[PDB]
Model the fold of this input.
Amino acid sequence: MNIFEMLRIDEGLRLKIYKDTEGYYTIGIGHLLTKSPSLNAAKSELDKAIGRNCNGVITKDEAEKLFNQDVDAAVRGILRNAKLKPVYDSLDAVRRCAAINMVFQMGETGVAGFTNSLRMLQQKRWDEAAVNLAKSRWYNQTPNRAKRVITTFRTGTWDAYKNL
Ligand SMILES: Cc1ccc(I)cc1
Ligand SMILES: [Ca+2]
Done:
């Protein structure tokens, strides 16, 4: 597929504010609104993001536009990061999608502990990288999604997403 199809499978689509797997207010195709426990704070973030008063509900077009912005922000964060860019540029197109997927889910700060995984990926030691990537809170907390992403890094194919 492509990064949009991959993340749409992993994140789903919901048009009303929901909570992600960590309990944080989210909307659309996995768009984090806030880590605050305040629903009103999440609603304010939503209105700011969409540019109108939504009271917690968006259209599919709005969800898809937010998603495009979020994917682009993940790519640009990789390209501006001196640690991530060299690894990203060493990867083929399918594995670059796996990298964007992780940055979309965890952000640049969430991936900061993956330094050894990043080195193994740049060295193209795929099985070793796959084992190392699984030794993570990420894998333990979202194992099905992590297994799909790890299989993508291990094989360089879309097999985990076609199988699903
Ligand atoms: C975990 C991870 C972070 C950034 C890249 I580029 C690849 C893998
Ligand atoms: Ca999961």
